[PDB]
Every structure is written in structure tokens, then in C-alpha cells.
């Protein structure tokens, strides 16, 4: 066997280790080269049958279609946000309250 280079874009190579599916969990994914992190949720949109994924007004990947089935999965980011500490002065007491 002899391999050749610089004739065309790559068009032959083997399996890519397809994996299972998870739902309603903050996981990271790689769908047809589109990386991202979010929560996989069943969608109610109606894709045209030639479009791999979708965006929104904010130009972020929110709807993706897995190449195994014809269904579409929404992408929403998992729980994030700042944390703030409610406390009186240390001269008064050491009781604290946590806000999310």
C-alpha cells in the first residue's frame, strides 16, 4: 500500500468512535466538529432536511442535529452566575448568608 498527498480534500478514513446519548445534563459534546458545552434537551423546532445545526439572534449555537437520527436537540447553557455574600460587620457577628 502507498499513500498519496496533495490531490484533493480528504475523502476516505475510518470510524470516528460514535458514543451514546445523555439528556437533561450539563455535558460537553462534539457534533460533526461543532464543539460546545450545554444541556441536551428535546426540541420542538422544524429543521429543513439539509441543515446541520442552527443559531439565533445572539449568534450562538442553540439547536444542533445529531447525525444518527433525524431528531434535533436544543442547546442551553447549564447553571452559571456569580455568588455574593451577605454579612454584617465583623465587629457585630460572624453570621453570613450566601446568595446565588
Amino acid at each position: 500500500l502507498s499513500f498519496e498527498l496533495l490531490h484533493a480534500p480528504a475523502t476516505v478514513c475510518g470510524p470516528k468512535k460514535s458514543t451514546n446519548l445523555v439528556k437533561n445534563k450539563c455535558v460537553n459534546f462534539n457534533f460533526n466538529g461543532l464543539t460546545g458545552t450545554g444541556v441536551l434537551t428535546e426540541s420542538n423546532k422544524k429543521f429543513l432536511p439539509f441543515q446541520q445545526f442552527g443559531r439565533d439572534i445572539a449568534d450562538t449555537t442553540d439547536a444542533v442535529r445529531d447525525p444518527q437520527t433525524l431528531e434535533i436537540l436544543d442547546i442551553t447553557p447549564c447553571s452559571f452566575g456569580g455568588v455574593s455574600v451577605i454579612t454584617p460587620g465583623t465587629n457585630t457577628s460572624n453570621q453570613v448568608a450566601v446568595l446565588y
Binding site: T60, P77, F80, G81, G82
Partner: peptide, 22 residues
């Protein structure tokens, strides 16, 4: 809500959180 207040209220439409007003 007063009718004037209602008329006024009906005529107004990652990493970026929005804090609600006090």
C-alpha cells in the same frame, strides 16, 4: 395600575447576567 400607567406600560417593549432592580 392606573389607566395612564397601563397605557405607558403597554407602549414600552454567556457571562452577561442582568441584575433585577431593587
Amino acid at each position: 395600575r392606573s389607566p395612564i400607567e397601563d397605557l405607558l406600560f403597554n407602549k414600552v417593549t454567556n457571562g452577561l447576567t442582568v441584575l433585577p432592580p431593587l
